Amino acid sequence: KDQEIKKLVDQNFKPLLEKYDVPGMAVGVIQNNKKYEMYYGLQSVQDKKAVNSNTIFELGSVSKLFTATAGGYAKNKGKISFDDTPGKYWKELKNTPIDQVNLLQLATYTSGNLALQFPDEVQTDQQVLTFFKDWKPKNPIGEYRQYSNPSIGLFGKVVALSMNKPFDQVLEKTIFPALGLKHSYVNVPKTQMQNYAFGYNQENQPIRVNPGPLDAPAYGVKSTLPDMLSFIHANLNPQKYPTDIQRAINETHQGRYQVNTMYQALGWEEFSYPATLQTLLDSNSEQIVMKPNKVTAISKEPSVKMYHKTGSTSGFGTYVVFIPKENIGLVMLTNKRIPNEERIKAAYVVLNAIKK
Ligand SMILES: *[B@]([O])([C][N]C(=O)/C(=N\OC([C])([C])C([O])=O)C1=[C]SC([N])=N1)OP([O])([O])=O
Numbered sequence: 001k002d003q004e005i006k007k008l009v010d011q012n013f014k015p016l017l018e019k020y021d022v023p024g025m026a027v028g029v030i031q032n033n034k035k036y037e038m039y040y041g042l043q044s045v046q047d048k049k050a051v052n053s054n055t056i057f058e059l060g061s062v063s064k065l066f067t068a069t070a071g072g073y074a075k076n077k078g079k080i081s082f083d084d085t086p087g088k089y090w091k092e093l094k095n096t097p098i099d100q101v102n103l104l105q106l107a108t109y110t111s112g113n114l115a116l117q118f119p120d121e122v123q124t125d126q127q128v129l130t131f132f133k134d135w136k137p138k139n140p141i142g143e144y145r146q147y148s149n150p151s152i153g154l155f156g157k158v159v160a161l162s163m164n165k166p167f168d169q170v171l172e173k174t175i176f177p178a179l180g181l182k183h184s185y186v187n188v189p190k191t192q193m194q195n196y197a198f199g200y201n202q203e204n205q206p207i208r209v210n211p212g213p214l215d216a217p218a219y220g221v222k223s224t225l226p227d228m229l230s231f232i233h234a235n236l237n238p239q240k241y242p243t244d245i246q247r248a249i250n251e252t253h254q255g256r257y258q259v260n261t262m263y264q265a266l267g268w269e270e271f272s273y274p275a276t277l278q279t280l281l282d283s284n285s286e287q288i289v290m291k292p293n294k295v296t297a298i299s300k301e302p303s304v305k306m307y308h309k310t311g312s313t314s315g316f317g318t319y320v321v322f323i324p325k326e327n328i329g330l331v332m333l334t335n336k337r338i339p340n341e342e343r344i345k346a347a348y349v350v351l352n353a354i355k356k
Pocket of ligand 1: 149309312315
């Protein structure tokens with residue numbers, strides 16, 4: 001049975017490399033605390049350098065899961081309340097319209113007036129402060145979900161303020177060590193640049209993510225397959241980890257509201273398990289990702305849950321999924337974007353063929 005995992009990943013993931021002309025891929029499965037690492041192709045086309053357990057990939061929006069974990073850690077240490085507003089920590093936002101939005105609404109994209117991205121012109125800290133000072137509501141606060149880098153970005157900045165550390169240090173000095181991650185970075189050091197994969201755009205030109213406003217909390221983390229399998233292990237089996245990070249992890253698993261079949265947790269998307277393929281595909285549909293959607297209160301609190309998150313930068317694709325009840329999870333890292341649908345479907349076939 002264990003011998004089948006490589007064959008399943010070869011059957012379902014390997015063909016995507018030829019299909020989308022992806023230079024390199026790392027696919028990890030964790031089942032009953034056993035890790036399986038499958039490596040394909042090249043971390044660098046020009047250097048002919050093979051993807052391996054040292055290869056560092058851009059996580060894109062999977063970074064939001066670390067931001068969520070940092071938030072849960074700060075909350076359970078009493079450094080913040082999710083009922084708090086940003087002005088309590090970022091003084092220059094005190095008594096401004098954005099100061100009517102609480103930390104949970106920022107983390108779960110329900111300010112009612114924040115788009116996917118900051119405007120291109122917003123780059124400096126001053127321009128970012130100005131943007132939030134000038135912010136005014138549109139939809140009723142807490143009622144509409146619009147997936148937003150600025151929204152969880154501001155949440156990340158406030159978490160960092162609450163811990164009196166820059167956000168990069170919150171992750172690199174507190175959260176990553178607590179999760180036992182050896183090669184996870186906001187800023188990849190000189191000594192690890194040799195292990196940092198090139199991303200490849202739709203013209204197969206090498207690219208890396210550029211600095212941007214509140215980039216670190218929104219899409220700014222880089223990691224290896226082993227590290228991301230450790231992170232999934234922590235989400236499946238927190239008991240081996242410190243109480244503080246156990247509490248932080250449990251906080252990220254709590255559904256806050258529904259958009260039909262999708263439950264918004266902290267960073268994580270949550271579903272009733274078993275979930276149909278189309279439920280998981282629907283979670284990252286144009287309608288859900290790009291448009292505002294009126295939320296409902298959770299009506300059906302699922303007994304048995306699964307969680308996933310996609311991530312993209314210009315050069316990298318990420319997908320992470322775990323199912324506590326089956327004690328299984330999967331990580332996919334590519335140094336070229338492939339459609340979300342392909343990531344979700346490949347993972348669905350593999351996880352459904354192992355478990356039973
Ligand atoms: B996350 O990753 C977010 N994302 C972002 O931001 C981006 N983009 O976006 C889109 C288009 C939507 C995609 O998908 O990709 C970017 C690019 S470059 C950078 N830095 N960033 O989440 P998702 O949804 O993506 O998964």
